[PDB]
Amino acid sequence: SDTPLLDQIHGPKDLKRLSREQLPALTEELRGEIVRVCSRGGLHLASSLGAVDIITALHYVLDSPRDRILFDVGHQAYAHKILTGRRDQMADIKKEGGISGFTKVSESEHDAITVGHASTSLANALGMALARDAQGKDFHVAAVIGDGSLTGGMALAALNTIGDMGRKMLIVLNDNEMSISENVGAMNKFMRGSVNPFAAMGVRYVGPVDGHNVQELVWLLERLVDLDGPTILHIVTTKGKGLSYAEADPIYWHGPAKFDPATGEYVPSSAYSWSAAFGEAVTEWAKTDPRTFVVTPAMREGSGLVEFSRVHPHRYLDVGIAEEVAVTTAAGMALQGMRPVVAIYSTFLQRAYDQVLHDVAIEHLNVTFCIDRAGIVGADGATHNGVFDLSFLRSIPGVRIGLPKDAAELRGMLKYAQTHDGPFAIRYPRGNTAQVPAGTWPDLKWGEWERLKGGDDVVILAGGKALDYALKAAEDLPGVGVVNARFVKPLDEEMLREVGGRARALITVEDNTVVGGFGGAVLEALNSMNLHPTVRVLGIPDEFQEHATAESVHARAGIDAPAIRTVLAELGVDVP
Amino acid sequence: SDTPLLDQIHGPKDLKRLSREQLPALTEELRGEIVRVCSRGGLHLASSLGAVDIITALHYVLDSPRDRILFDVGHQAYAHKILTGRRDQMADIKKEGGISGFTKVSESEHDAITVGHASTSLANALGMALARDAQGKDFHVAAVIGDGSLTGGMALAALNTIGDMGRKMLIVLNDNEMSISENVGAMNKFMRGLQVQKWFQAVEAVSKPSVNPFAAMGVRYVGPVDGHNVQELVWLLERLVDLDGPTILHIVTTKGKGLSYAEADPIYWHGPAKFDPATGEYVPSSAYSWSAAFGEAVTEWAKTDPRTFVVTPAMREGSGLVEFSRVHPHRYLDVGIAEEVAVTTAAGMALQGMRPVVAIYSTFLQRAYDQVLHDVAIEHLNVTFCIDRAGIVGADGATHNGVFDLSFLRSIPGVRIGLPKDAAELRGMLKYAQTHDGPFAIRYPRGNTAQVPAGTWPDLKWGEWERLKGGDDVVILAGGKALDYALKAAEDLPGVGVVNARFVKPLDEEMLREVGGRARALITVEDNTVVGGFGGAVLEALNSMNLHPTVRVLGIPDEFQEHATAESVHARAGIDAPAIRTVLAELGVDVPIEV
Ligand SMILES: Cc1ncc(C[n+]2c([C@@](C)(O)P(=O)(O)OCCc3cn([C@H](Cc4ccccc4)C(=O)O)nn3)sc(CCOP(=O)(O)OP(=O)(O)O)c2C)c(N)n1
Ligand SMILES: Cc1ncc(C[n+]2c([C@@](C)(O)P(=O)(O)OCCc3cn([C@H](Cc4ccccc4)C(=O)O)nn3)sc(CCOP(=O)(O)OP(=O)(O)O)c2C)c(N)n1
Ligand SMILES: [Mg+2]
Ligand SMILES: [Mg+2]
Ligand code: NA
Ligand code: NA
């Protein structure tokens, strides 16, 4: 066996039987294990490699699950799961029925918080420490937060309260100068250069120290965890530590495809994502529109903006992991005559709900939202599934919402949004779509749907990913109409009145929760028109969806093509 | 006239014609004017009094509307409106048809941002500065932010970006150590030990011909300086606004400066009732608010439940928690103006076996949407939300009307939602939430309700509605404030049923199926937007049951509601008792005519 030490470790108690001089050899076994686990692709390789040493030291010094160790985001905690009885389960991580890719309270007593969104560790740790003190208990509370997660407002404000309350707790700042891209912000710049950067926070500050010296970290943790008041242990790590290819390019190896550990060669994703279609469109648009300015909250790569940032460096802003700052900064730009575009994932847009409502919508400002990862994202599970934006955006006055069926319709909606007054949201899923020629800028009327298949018996209303399911479902069913419901706000009131009054039954399909989303909008509009057709609302149930493929989630949610055909048969359609 | 200088000032241009030595006399006129404006009650007296001198200095040095002066919250900007052509309109401020109580872009070219929620000034200012630089323009950008607003995460994160971009802009930190209550947080404690610097007489001006609390932000830091020395503020602003990179000017002000009663108690005088400026005596609010009913209930509950822990984001007074904080000091937490921290801290408490209660206004709960969804709901944690100012709040207008919580909470899996009709039902819902698994939200309006005896703790079944008026022909479904309208509307209409729909999540599926299948028409009423709220929930449930009765959904339209009385907003929205009677007549009910 290549891992003699790890073979005897089934929990933190087994780990403590090792001597301190054996810990360096253990971290090497852990790194090799993490490399093999991630070699199949789609996992958080570089972040978990960087955190191996601090995780080993923390579990060697602390007594989990009696002590609580909290991970921010949780993507860097593969060594934590390997050391807490889940080594064998790492083979199926993020697979349906397997363990989560992040720490999850229901999965293990050793997982103190359920995470996926960034910057929640500090407020969670404060609550646990206050609860401990209120109950008269004495256990240790420790939080591991990266330099990227520290840019979030809810981490900075929580630290302000933590310094005020002065309770026993340890914060490990895992500083590798990386987020997904290189980290941004003034704090990141300041820390690159004997002063306590958190002196105004009233928090004890130790470091920076070598985040890969596992024996020194153990020695340090032993002399800090029992001190009075909160402490920040600032460690410096190399993202991807232990794999030369990952250290050289920590951006790609943050989430590599299937790769060969001996050569570093990986499967290039030669697909054309929706993200690349947006990036191509907005890079093209900004060439002729000097008012366009793109803001991302730390997702230049995921949103498809690498080429944009290179071609338009003076129209690009990365605010770090601060979705709230991204939206309100865009509002200020719109107030000064710009045409800002906020590129943001649906799940992360949840963080900026009040900024959309209060800072953008009240004055009806010219902010365009290009919303990636809309709908079920799949393997990242409940913390990342973007199945709520059709509900929470819809109830904001003046926020228009569109769902493009392809890249040409995306360009048409972006063009409309950038040339018309007020806020517009354009949401599209994880996945691929056909490339269109440069200069494709069709004119569309916002709010007008388009019928794609004839039929008056039963008519399916769907947009985006749900529309692909609907067209496939009605593929061989004459008389089943399909309408591209590419606008959720406003609805096509004229076509809905006509179709709702003439059809015996309607089906709405949405890659969104059924609660208050597109189906609810259709029912509200039909009621206002005093029309009462039979309607089957298909969508994600009012339940969080665990990690699986999006197709599996959609099959069990009842929105894929076979599920629609079953509903069609229930409505009396002659399905073969 | 008592105000000879102000009588000749109709804008910043007139102000600049004064000499610097006349500015102290002008601030005295402005303070007297603000006191008279606020004497009718219901206005932000102490904050605007504290900000008189910095506002006068900013308009004397800068050139609004060419330069942009941004106010965080905007409640401290009465002197700003008086100096920008709105002096006469101050008599009708926050009244329907009058000017807003906060700065508003559509109201004046001098109002750079529309505000009400705190901590938005810094990100807005950053966007304006980036837009200015992208367009090649050269105007000044200045933001005024209080020490309370600086506790918000979106202000701290924006400052981190502001230091990174390094653009020309000025941030005035208006530090009075007050939020509503005394300010909290480590930054407030740290700045208490900072000594005031004397620049204009000129010790500090000679020293540079001592620590920066924002050193890690890469921002120039000047101060703290006397925030009431208007000539020194002018002298400082002239020598700062044209420098490269961002600057924080830290000023120290006294909340309520100029009125002895307000300086002595800046908490009450943050928003005083009708008062006599010569005596300081004010009309006491002898009413019993929903806030007081919640405060009494949770203070009583925590005596027998050591797991209860109340968290507020800087709203101890408004949420009714003053007595709680005194009776249960070790079970009370104020996180500052950081709703996001309040909810996630409560999540951490629930994970360690506590029974936290988050007290929060509906409009401010919007700030914590993701923390409710991601940090509380995914693991179905024991957080109870007691939501004040639910529905239309009225005079504070669009930035404060809490008409969205029945929509954004309803689509979060596992979040139960209740609307108590009175204090006994509030206690019943609080009792249920604190003894059952998962998150619960209890929302109630600004306004009053009868006091109930101590020890009132009824048992209710969460999710069960209660019929209050007989009738199967037409049935009104409403809860909370909307229910009072419904009962008043059907008061003399036998056969018009009224159901206390006191639970929005879940609905009473059993009663809705029976009533929806037997009634020819239903009316839903909600103090909430009609988009995705209670009416939408009923339509979704009726559709799942394949029931198609006539349904009239009454609620707030899909439009922001400007400042007015709640009664005026509800009259025009169509949910008050006369509007319901009109709908009943449209549905064929024999409603007595008035002729
Ligand atoms: C509030 C908020 N805002 C943003 C984020 C996003 N984010 C985090 C993550 C885990 O969602 P993300 O990986 O981006 O997955 C976003 C969703 C996603 C998934 N796929 C996969 C491809 C794939 C990607 C990554 C790994 C494996 C496969 C696909 O589609 O095939 N593509 N995209 S992590 C981080 C930096 C932390 O920086 P630090 O705190 O310094 O930590 P450090 O790594 O340096 O140790 C950031 C910014 C967040 N959490 N929360
Ligand atoms: C995200 C967020 N969270 C919270 C707030 C609340 N808040 C602000 C306000 C203007 O809503 P609020 O007044 O509380 O009105 C809240 C709504 C409200 C209205 N009535 C009236 C009673 C009344 C109150 C006030 C004036 C007049 C009458 C009623 O019903 O009869 N009762 N309640 S102001 C501030 C401190 C800033 O501190 P600083 O930044 O340091 O400024 P400083 O004052 O020191 O100069 C805070 C915390 C906010 N903005 N944004
Ligand atoms: Mg990092
Ligand atoms: Mg203050
Ligand atoms: Na626009
Ligand atoms: Na509970």
Residue numbers in the entry:
A (entry chain B): 8 to 200, 244 to 626
B (entry chain A): 8 to 208, 217 to 224, 244 to 629
Give the exact sentences the study uses for this entry.
1-Deoxy-d-xylulose 5-phosphate synthase (DXPS) converts pyruvate and d-glyceraldehyde 3-phosphate (d-GAP) to DXP, which is required for synthesis of essential vitamins and isoprenoids in bacterial pathogens. DXPS catalyzes the decarboxylative condensation of pyruvate and d-glyceraldehyde 3-phosphate (d-GAP) in a thiamin diphosphate (ThDP)-dependent manner to form DXP. DXP is a versatile metabolite that, depending on cellular requirements and nutrient availability, may be shuttled for use in vitamin biosynthesis (ThDP and pyridoxal phosphate) and generation of isoprenoid precursors via the methylerythritol phosphate (MEP) pathway. DXPS is active as a homodimer.
A triazole-based acetylphosphonate (TrAP) analog from this series, derived from d-phenylalanine (d-PheTrAP, 1), displays submicromolar inhibitory activity and high selectivity for DXPS over the structurally similar ThDP-dependent enzyme pyruvate dehydrogenase (PDH). Given that O2 induces LThDP decarboxylation, potentially contributing to DXPS conformational flexibility, crystallization was conducted under anaerobic conditions. Using a similar approach, DrDXPS was incubated and crystallized with excess 1, and the resulting DXPS-PLThDP structure was solved to 1.98 Å resolution in the same space group and cell dimensions as the DXPS-PLThDP structure obtained from cocrystallization of DXPS with MAP. The X-ray structure obtained from cocrystallization of DrDXPS with 1 indicates the formation of the PLThDP adduct by reaction of the acetylphosphonate mimic of pyruvate with the C2 carbanion of ThDP. The PLThDP adduct is evident in the active site with H51 and H304 forming favorable electrostatic interactions with the phosphonate moiety and H434 and N4′ of ThDP within hydrogen bond distance of the phosphonolactyl hydroxyl group. As predicted, GAP binding residues R423 and R480 form favorable electrostatic interactions with the carboxyl group of the d-Phe moiety. Y395, also implicated in d-GAP binding, and R423 form hydrogen bonds with the triazole ring. The benzyl group of the d-Phe moiety is in close proximity to K101, suggesting a potential cation−π interaction. A 1,2,4-butanetriol molecule from the crystallization condition is also found in the active site, in one of two subunits, and forms hydrogen bonds with the backbone carboxyl group of I301 and the phosphonate moiety of the PLThDP adduct. Consistent with this idea, R99 remains within hydrogen bond distance of its neighboring residues of this active site network in the E-PLThDP structure derived from 1 and in the docked model of E-PLThDP derived from 8.
